[PDB]
Amino acid sequence: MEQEKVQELVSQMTLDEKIAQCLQLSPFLFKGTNKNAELTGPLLQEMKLTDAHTENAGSVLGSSSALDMIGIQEAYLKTNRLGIPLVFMADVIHGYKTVFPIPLALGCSFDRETVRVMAEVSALEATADGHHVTFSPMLDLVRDPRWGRVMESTGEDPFLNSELGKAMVDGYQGDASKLNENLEQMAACVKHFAAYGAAEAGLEYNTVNMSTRELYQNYLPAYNAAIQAGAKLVMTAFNVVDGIPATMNKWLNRDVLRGEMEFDGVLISAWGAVAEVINHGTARNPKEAAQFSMEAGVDLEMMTTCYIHELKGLIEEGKLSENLLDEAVLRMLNLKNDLGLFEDPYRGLKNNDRTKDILTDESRGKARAAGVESAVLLENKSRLLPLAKEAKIALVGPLATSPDILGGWNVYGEEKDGINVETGLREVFETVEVVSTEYTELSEEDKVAVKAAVQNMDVVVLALGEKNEWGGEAGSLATIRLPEAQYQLAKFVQTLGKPVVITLFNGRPLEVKELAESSDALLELWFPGTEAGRVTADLLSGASNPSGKLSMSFPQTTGQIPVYYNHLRTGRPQTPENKGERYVSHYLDIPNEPFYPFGYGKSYSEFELKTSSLPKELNLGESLHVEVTIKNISDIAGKEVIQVYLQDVTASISRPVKELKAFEKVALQAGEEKTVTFELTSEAFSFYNHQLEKVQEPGLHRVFVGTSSEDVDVFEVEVGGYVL
């Protein structure tokens, strides 16, 4: 509908209707739900919600199905005075029913198209079941694998996170201006604004603190990129940002997000985050919480009641302007209008059962392809991998048969539809003997069984990993190790004298030195989703060739955290020249280097790269064009991730030794050669100074081209002169 009519609607709403429009509830709080109706009476009572509230609520989250949505929306519209439909939102993080790899794995793909396809399939399915908005992409920069929510991020690099966040937004939304016509696309919601991933000591919901300059330099760019690409909503974070809970942080939300970033859509609280400013000690009671959160521009309170119970009194007493409320309401109505809800409140579903669009073989093949892009081959000593299809496999461990391979933040996908490692392997390999063990134990009976199977077979596929519940939200591990029984299993298997491949399933970087050293090959599958066992067999058999690269460093030990590629030099860097000397930046007990670095991953192929001759000088404002020729010099088709880093050698702020500024994943047949070109604009040379200006300074830069943050050629360019 026309904008004037949307505005007319705000004019016609009562104060009570406006206030309720800013409330989001679970589906079973509404009449006409078709699941958990037993919960309705008591929770309404505990939250002090009445029909006047629920008949005028703005939004539902976590609808259980299309029939839930239709039932709720049909009942709601029979009673709603002005005919303002509900907007339905859901956590579609890495797939709906067809589950794709967890986002940290998708990070390791270094493949924008993989990420866009994942998001496109997710929306196809989730719109089929009645959802209008997804709480994705998650764009929190992560340096601390203790935090269980690293699985939701694409990792430690702001540029990669930025690029892949744009890819996700494009996949969910397509052309954002046509979300009222394209009903298999859905609105995206960027989360969590901001810097949630810096939770101190890896502890869920904990303190975040960093300088404003560092917040701009590293922690804000991915949110900004997704906002500029047209993400429709933004969601607040649970943490303080410089001492003030994000939800009520007016500088963050009004000055940065709405002002500088020019975001003009709905700002939704994380769950209960409005009320939880009271816990943080920055609001005395729900009245202050409501006032401060509305002052900060939070439009939609997720499942708490501060707005609903307090806004009327604040407005009547003159402590809050009703204009702020009208602004929030208008943004809510505009979101609904963008989704087409005033013309079709059922968004395509009313006369059109799209059941058939869910969990198709096509979508499954795309989830398999995502998993084979995202896995990272970490070790392969003496070409153990790929295995011949006639290889006799002893498949042993806790991940041999476990159906828990879909990942955390899987709200809608079902394990009954997933493919476990055994099932995947048996489709490919004729001879497999299986010995399942428990996740946290290694018995004498297990050892006897394992030794028998290994003796019978020729190679060991040792399937290790995490239960998904050991990560995700409020899954913090102080020690980033598998259960000790799993390391003991690996040590035992090594003694048996056969070659061992470890296929590792997990949601965070772990201490894997003991695994790498106890086996011949190490394949990081992360959690691949629905097709996990087929992803695993295809990579092991060579039907697919591993091409993922680490998007997050793997520490030597827990106590190395945080360790990351884009670090500062210090005043006393350890060099090859001074290594062993006491008075330099080092640990007495471990190397400075992570066990594996950003951008690292192995392949069954071998590749050669060469960079075309670069200018020795550049003007300010001028782009650097980097041309790279890559050849596959092996007999095996595969993909390589070409990475380009920049370093600012001297600056008014100490700058990182490298920062990723371009990447492309290149597919090459045996012997095939291709040429790729990158443009590093002057923005790539730029950074935030002590006064928070984004600046470009003349001086020397180094340009690194290669296949990891370590395996690079280095070039120098002197920037100066005039500004183009």
Residue owning tokens 């986002």: 103
Task: Kindly tell me which of 207 and 612 has the beta carbon lying closer to a copy of itself.
Answer: 207
Query: Among the candidate windows 445-453, 525-533, 553-561, 595-603, which touches a copy of itself by CB under 8 A?
Result: 553-561
Task: Kindly tell me which of 199 and 435 has the beta carbon lying closer to a copy of itself.
Answer: 199
- Assign 711 to helix, strand or coil: coil
Helix (H) or strand (E) holding 677: strand 673-680
Closest CA to 595 of 503, 481, 465, 478: 481
Instruction: Note whether 552 binds a copy of itself by CB under 8 A.
Output: no
| Cβ–Cβ < 8 Å for 645, 660 | yes
Residue 111 assigned to a binding site: no
Instruction: Note whether 6 binds Mg ion by CB under 5 A.
Output: no
In which region does residue 356 sit, left (phi positive, over 0), alpha (psi from -120 to 50) or beta (all else)? alpha
* Size of the residue set binding a copy of itself (CB under 8 A): 79
Task: Kindly tell me which of 108 and 684 has the beta carbon lying closer to Mg ion.
Answer: 684
Measured between alpha carbons, how far is 255 from 252 in angstroms, rounded to an integer?
6
- The phi, psi pair for 9, rounded to 5°, reads -60, -45
In the shown chain, the binding pattern of residues 245 to 284 toward ligand BGC, with x for contact by CB under 6 A and - for none, equals --------------------------x-------------
Instruction: Note whether 559 binds a copy of itself by CB under 8 A.
Output: yes
- Assign 313 to helix, strand or coil: helix
* Size of the residue set binding ligand BGC (CB under 6 A): 3
Candidate residues 164, 561, 666, 684; the one interacting with a copy of itself per rule CB under 8 A: 561
| Contacts of a copy of itself in 462-481 (CB under 8 A) | 470, 473-480
Query: Among the candidate windows 39-47, 111-119, 163-171, 649-657, which touches a copy of itself by CB under 8 A?
Result: 649-657
Measured between alpha carbons, how far is 327 from 244 in angstroms, rounded to an integer?
23
Closest CA to 273 of 251, 303, 295: 303
Instruction: Note whether 46 binds ligand BGC by CB under 6 A.
Output: no
Measured between alpha carbons, how far is 598 from 582 in angstroms, rounded to an integer?
27
Instruction: Note whether 486 binds a copy of itself by CB under 8 A.
Output: no
N- to C-terminal Cα distance for the chain? 45
Q: Which does 573 bind (CB under 5 to 8 A by kind): Mg ion, a copy of itself, ligand BGC, none?
A: a copy of itself
- Assign 583 to helix, strand or coil: coil
Q: Which does 42 bind (CB under 5 to 8 A by kind): ligand BGC, Mg ion, a copy of itself, none?
A: none
Instruction: Note whether 203 binds a copy of itself by CB under 8 A.
Output: yes
In which region does residue 621 sit, left (phi positive, over 0), alpha (psi from -120 to 50) or beta (all else)? left
Task: Kindly tell me which of 378 and 561 has the beta carbon lying closer to a copy of itself.
Answer: 561
User: Three-state SS across 50-72?
Assistant: CHHHHCCCCEEECCCCHHHHHHH
CB atoms within 10 A of CB 376: 24
Task: Kindly tell me which of 30 and 565 has the beta carbon lying closer to ligand BGC.
Answer: 30
Task: Kindly tell me which of 162 and 305 has the beta carbon lying closer to ligand BGC.
Answer: 305
Measured between alpha carbons, how far is 501 from 463 in angstroms, rounded to an integer?
8
Instruction: Note whether 592 binds a copy of itself by CB under 8 A.
Output: yes
Give me the DSSP letters along 251-285: IIIIIIIIIIS---S-EEPSTTTTTHHHHTTS-SS
| Contacts of Mg ion in 622-651 (CB under 5 A) | 648, 650-651
Describe the crossing of helices 3-12 and 322-338 by its angle, rounded to 10 degrees: 140
Q: Which does 548 bind (CB under 5 to 8 A by kind): a copy of itself, Mg ion, ligand BGC, none?
A: none
In which region does residue 64 sit, left (phi positive, over 0), alpha (psi from -120 to 50) or beta (all else)? alpha
| Contacts of a copy of itself in 668-707 (CB under 8 A) | 690, 699-700
By CB atoms closer than 10 A (0-12, 13-18, 19+), residue 442 is buried
By CB atoms closer than 10 A (0-12, 13-18, 19+), residue 485 is middle
In the shown chain, the binding pattern of residues 61 to 80 toward ligand BGC, with x for contact by CB under 6 A and - for none, equals --------------------
Instruction: Note whether 659 binds Mg ion by CB under 5 A.
Output: no
Computed from CA positions of residues 98, 103, 105, 106, in that sequence, does the dihedral angle turn out positive or negative?
positive
Residue 360 assigned to a binding site: no
In the bound complex, what is the minimum distance in angstroms from residue 141's beta carbon to Mg ion? 23
Query: Among the candidate windows 24-32, 46-54, 177-185, 568-576, which touches a copy of itself by CB under 8 A?
Result: 568-576
In the bound complex, what is the minimum distance in angstroms from residue 257's beta carbon to ligand BGC? 21
- Assign 562 to helix, strand or coil: coil
Q: Which does 401 bind (CB under 5 to 8 A by kind): Mg ion, a copy of itself, ligand BGC, none?
A: none
Task: Kindly tell me which of 282 and 629 has the beta carbon lying closer to a copy of itself.
Answer: 282
Describe the crossing of helices 112-128 and 158-173 by its angle, rounded to 10 degrees: 40
In the bound complex, what is the minimum distance in angstroms from residue 234's beta carbon to ligand BGC? 17
Instruction: Note whether 41 binds a copy of itself by CB under 8 A.
Output: no
Instruction: Note whether 473 binds ligand BGC by CB under 6 A.
Output: yes
In the shown chain, the binding pattern of residues 230 to 259 toward a copy of itself, with x for contact by CB under 8 A and - for none, equals --------xxx-xxxx-----x--------
Instruction: Note whether 412 binds ligand BGC by CB under 6 A.
Output: no
Q: Which does 36 bind (CB under 5 to 8 A by kind): a copy of itself, ligand BGC, Mg ion, none?
A: none
* Size of the residue set binding Mg ion (CB under 5 A): 5
Measured between alpha carbons, how far is 598 from 710 in angstroms, rounded to an integer?
8
Instruction: Note whether 151 binds a copy of itself by CB under 8 A.
Output: no
Closest CA to 712 of 555, 590, 600, 558: 600
303 DSSP β-pair partners: none
- Assign 344 to helix, strand or coil: coil
Closest CA to 207 of 167, 233, 243: 243
| Cβ–Cβ < 8 Å for 422, 579 | no
Count CA within 13 A, CB hemisphere, residue 558.
11
In the bound complex, what is the minimum distance in angstroms from residue 644's beta carbon to ligand BGC? 36
| Cβ–Cβ < 8 Å for 643, 660 | yes
Instruction: Note whether 214 binds a copy of itself by CB under 8 A.
Output: yes
In the bound complex, what is the minimum distance in angstroms from residue 214's beta carbon to a copy of itself? 5
Candidate residues 206, 623, 682, 696; the one interacting with a copy of itself per rule CB under 8 A: 206
In the bound complex, what is the minimum distance in angstroms from residue 718's beta carbon to Mg ion? 10
Measure the CA angle with vertex 516, ends 515 and 520; round to 5°: 110
Task: Kindly tell me which of 146 and 366 has the beta carbon lying closer to a copy of itself.
Answer: 146
Measured between alpha carbons, how far is 191 from 152 in angstroms, rounded to an integer?
10
Q: Which does 589 bind (CB under 5 to 8 A by kind): a copy of itself, Mg ion, ligand BGC, none?
A: a copy of itself
Instruction: Note whether 699 binds Mg ion by CB under 5 A.
Output: yes
| Contacts of a copy of itself in 287-306 (CB under 8 A) | 288
Strand order in the sheet with 673-680: 607-611, 624-632, 673-680
Instruction: Note whether 653 binds a copy of itself by CB under 8 A.
Output: yes
| Contacts of ligand BGC in 579-608 (CB under 6 A) | 583
Instruction: Note whether 578 binds a copy of itself by CB under 8 A.
Output: no
In the bound complex, what is the minimum distance in angstroms from residue 713's beta carbon to ligand BGC? 33
In the bound complex, what is the minimum distance in angstroms from residue 26's beta carbon to ligand BGC? 8
Candidate residues 100, 205, 409, 487; the one interacting with a copy of itself per rule CB under 8 A: 205
Binding interface with Mg ion (CB under 5 A): 648, 650-651, 697, 699
Binding-site entries: 648, 650
Binding interface with ligand BGC (CB under 6 A): 271, 473, 583
Binding-site entries for Mg(2+): 648, 650
